[PDB]
Design an enzyme around this catalytic site. Structure first.
Site, PDB file in Angstrom:
ATOM      1  CG  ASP A   1      11.193 -28.421   3.866  1.00 18.88           C
ATOM      2  OD1 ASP A   1       9.951 -28.555   3.879  1.00 18.88           O
ATOM      3  OD2 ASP A   1      11.784 -27.681   3.053  1.00 18.88           O
TER       4      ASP A   1
ATOM      5  NE  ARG B   1       7.721 -27.844  -0.237  1.00 14.78           N
ATOM      6  CZ  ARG B   1       6.732 -28.058   0.620  1.00 14.78           C
ATOM      7  NH1 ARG B   1       5.543 -28.475   0.214  1.00 14.78           N
ATOM      8  NH2 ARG B   1       6.942 -27.857   1.918  1.00 14.78           N
ATOM      9  CG  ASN B   2      11.380 -30.057  -0.300  1.00 16.16           C
ATOM     10  OD1 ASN B   2      11.588 -29.230  -1.187  1.00 16.16           O
ATOM     11  ND2 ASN B   2      10.870 -29.727   0.882  1.00 16.16           N
TER      12      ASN B   2
ATOM     13  CG  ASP C   1      14.649 -28.929   0.802  1.00 13.66           C
ATOM     14  OD1 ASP C   1      15.430 -27.958   0.738  1.00 13.66           O
ATOM     15  OD2 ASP C   1      13.599 -28.918   1.473  1.00 13.66           O
TER      16      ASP C   1
HETATM   17  C1  I90 Z   1      12.309 -29.532 -14.564  1.00 13.69           C
HETATM   18  N1  I90 Z   1      13.550 -30.210 -14.121  1.00 13.69           N
HETATM   19  C2  I90 Z   1      14.222 -29.939 -13.002  1.00 13.69           C
HETATM   20  C3  I90 Z   1      15.259 -30.763 -12.998  1.00 13.69           C
HETATM   21  C4  I90 Z   1      16.191 -30.844 -12.052  1.00 13.69           C
HETATM   22  C5  I90 Z   1      17.156 -31.841 -12.115  1.00 13.69           C
HETATM   23  N2  I90 Z   1      18.129 -31.939 -11.116  1.00 13.69           N
HETATM   24  C6  I90 Z   1      18.140 -31.075 -10.092  1.00 13.69           C
HETATM   25  C7  I90 Z   1      19.113 -31.188  -9.106  1.00 13.69           C
HETATM   26  C8  I90 Z   1      19.133 -30.295  -8.042  1.00 13.69           C
HETATM   27  C9  I90 Z   1      18.177 -29.290  -7.962  1.00 13.69           C
HETATM   28  C10 I90 Z   1      18.196 -28.400  -6.897  1.00 13.69           C
HETATM   29  C11 I90 Z   1      18.136 -29.189  -5.589  1.00 13.69           C
HETATM   30  N3  I90 Z   1      16.735 -29.449  -5.183  1.00 13.69           N
HETATM   31  N4  I90 Z   1      15.794 -29.014  -5.884  1.00 13.69           N
HETATM   32  C12 I90 Z   1      14.505 -29.224  -5.558  1.00 13.69           C
HETATM   33  C13 I90 Z   1      13.471 -28.725  -6.343  1.00 13.69           C
HETATM   34  C14 I90 Z   1      12.186 -28.702  -5.814  1.00 13.69           C
HETATM   35  C15 I90 Z   1      11.120 -28.207  -6.553  1.00 13.69           C
HETATM   36  C16 I90 Z   1      11.347 -27.726  -7.833  1.00 13.69           C
HETATM   37  C17 I90 Z   1      12.630 -27.744  -8.366  1.00 13.69           C
HETATM   38  N5  I90 Z   1      12.823 -27.281  -9.594  1.00 13.69           N
HETATM   39  O1  I90 Z   1      12.449 -25.932  -9.883  1.00 13.69           O
HETATM   40  O2  I90 Z   1      13.365 -28.152 -10.572  1.00 13.69           O
HETATM   41  C18 I90 Z   1      13.698 -28.241  -7.624  1.00 13.69           C
HETATM   42  C19 I90 Z   1      14.184 -29.934  -4.411  1.00 13.69           C
HETATM   43  C20 I90 Z   1      15.225 -30.416  -3.637  1.00 13.69           C
HETATM   44  C21 I90 Z   1      16.518 -30.150  -4.058  1.00 13.69           C
HETATM   45  O3  I90 Z   1      17.470 -30.559  -3.394  1.00 13.69           O
HETATM   46  C22 I90 Z   1      17.201 -29.178  -8.942  1.00 13.69           C
HETATM   47  C23 I90 Z   1      17.183 -30.069 -10.010  1.00 13.69           C
HETATM   48  C24 I90 Z   1      16.202 -29.952 -10.987  1.00 13.69           C
HETATM   49  C25 I90 Z   1      15.205 -31.519 -14.081  1.00 13.69           C
HETATM   50  N6  I90 Z   1      14.119 -31.125 -14.745  1.00 13.69           N
END
Ligand code: I90
Length: 281
Positions: free
Chosen positions: A140, A144-145, A158
């Site tokens: 994947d 975005r990931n 991700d």
């Molecule tokens: C607007 N902001 C988001 C972050 C932020 C900072 N640290 C993060 C550490 C882990 C995760 C969850 C793990 N993780 N998340 C995404 C992800 C993808 C798209 C949108 C978002 N998202 O909605 O932020 C997260 C993709 C792969 C992944 O492994 C999200 C995080 C999000 C900081 N500022």
């Protein structure tokens, strides 16, 4: 069996700021968090909850499948700070200042240069070369990931305990298997057989490179999810972005070869990109 006991974070060592949501996966939300370190330092962190999956069997299968990420260690691979038990299996991850890679490059108020974007793709290639060396298939890979931290360091994310759907728009759910399929990032042979390899990761990496050079444009905007397989079977591919150097586009076309064997390895990709990164653009 609890090999997770080596990465367990004590409840009194973690505060989850539930009033601050920084992500929404199908398995649960992502929250701001405060973690007390080994040595007594307070670090900003992100807490991913898995409370949306409600089954002791499906919980434990997700943990043992993802606990392997504790053994991974690479500057371009997202690390696991630990997991917490109570609140339902929380997965503690390092906080990424600039969020996911696609949202950073899509923001107009940001001014990444052409060299910045090529450097981002080089970092993804390095993180994927490490994962391929450990015989780990991502399945994947997409802009975005991947995450971008304070030091402009890209983290392939991700995967493992961090695996989830954070953007439902680009996924199809197979109605027999549970498979979540990111149609427009998948290799042609993956759309046909639903099998994934490091070589199909190479295909998805090509799309990610194309995402970077367009600063987050959606791939194949005029090809619906049914016609995509014939579109690819006719030899048609994503077109060269206006500000993508010709040698970088040739790297993209190599990633989208119909024969999975014929595609370059991630180690070959690191060499070609870093060479492009160091030369005049
Ligand atoms: C607007 N902001 C988001 C972050 C932020 C900072 N640290 C993060 C550490 C882990 C995760 C969850 C793990 N993780 N998340 C995404 C992800 C993808 C798209 C949108 C978002 N998202 O909605 O932020 C997260 C993709 C792969 C992944 O492994 C999200 C995080 C999000 C900081 N500022």
């Amino acid at each position: 069996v609890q090999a997770v006991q080596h990465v367990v974070i004590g409840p009194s060592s973690l505060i989850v700021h539930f009033n601050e949501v920084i992500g929404r996966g199908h398995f649960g939300c992502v929250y701001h968090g405060t973690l007390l370190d080994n040595d007594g330092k307070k670090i900003h962190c992100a807490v991913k909850s898995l409370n949306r999956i409600t089954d002791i069997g499906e919980v434990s299968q997700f943990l043992t499948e993802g606990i392997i990420m504790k053994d991974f260690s690479h500057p371009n691979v997202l690390s696991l700070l630990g997991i917490c038990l109570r609140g339902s299996p929380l997965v503690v991850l390092p906080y990424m200042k600039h969020g996911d890679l696609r949202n950073f490059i899509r923001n107009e108020t940001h001014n990444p240069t052409v060299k910045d974007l090529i450097g981002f793709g080089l970092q993804v290639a390095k993180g994927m070369k490490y994962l391929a060396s450990k015989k780990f298939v991502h399945r994947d890979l997409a802009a975005r990931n991947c995450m971008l931290d304070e030091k402009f360091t890209v983290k392939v994310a991700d995967f493992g305990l961090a695996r989830d759907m954070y953007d439902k728009e680009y996924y199809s759910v197979h109605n027999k298997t549970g498979a979540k399929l990111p149609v427009k990032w998948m290799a042609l042979e993956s759309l046909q057989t639903q099998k994934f390899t490091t070589k199909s990761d190479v295909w998805s990496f090509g799309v990610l490179l194309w995402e970077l050079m367009t600063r987050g444009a959606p791939p194949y905007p005029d090809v619906n999810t049914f016609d995509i397989t014939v579109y690819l079977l006719q030899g048609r591919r994503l077109l060269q972005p206006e500000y993508c150097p010709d040698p970088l586009y040739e790297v993209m076309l190599k990633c989208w070869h119909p024969k999975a064997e014929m595609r370059p390895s991630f180690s070959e990709l690191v060499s070609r990109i870093s060479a492009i990164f160091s030369t005049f653009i």
